[PDB]
Symmetry: C3
Subunit: 45 residues, 3 copies
Amino acid sequence: RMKQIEDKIEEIESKQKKIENEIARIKKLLQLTVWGIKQLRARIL
Amino acid sequence: RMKQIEDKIEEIESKQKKIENEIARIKKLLQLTVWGIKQLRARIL
Amino acid sequence: RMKQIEDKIEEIESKQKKIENEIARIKKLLQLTVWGIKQLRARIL
Ligand SMILES: [Cl-]
Ligand SMILES: [Cl-]
């Protein structure tokens, strides 16, 4: 039963790592969209 | 004590599923904002 | 061994809380970028 719990924890940890990786990618893209809106407003208006 | 650990794991798993769902929604909206910035720049500039 | 499992669960929970916090911040910034694209399109076009 302990091994079953340990395996489930490993699975949750692995997925948490994937989620953290996704979040960093989202943050980077979000920063690029901020840049684009800022560049648009400045270059046009 | 094992049941207490198993219940906590279930709670963490449930919340992880909610987080994954939120992340997909964020990604989709982020893709729409990219589209909007791209469409703006192309249609105007 | 139970304490080791309980400590790992605490670590995963702590990181899950940080992730939830990050997600809320991403959502708020994403809402601001939506506002900016909407304001741009309306003010210009
Ligand atoms: Cl997670
Ligand atoms: Cl965006």
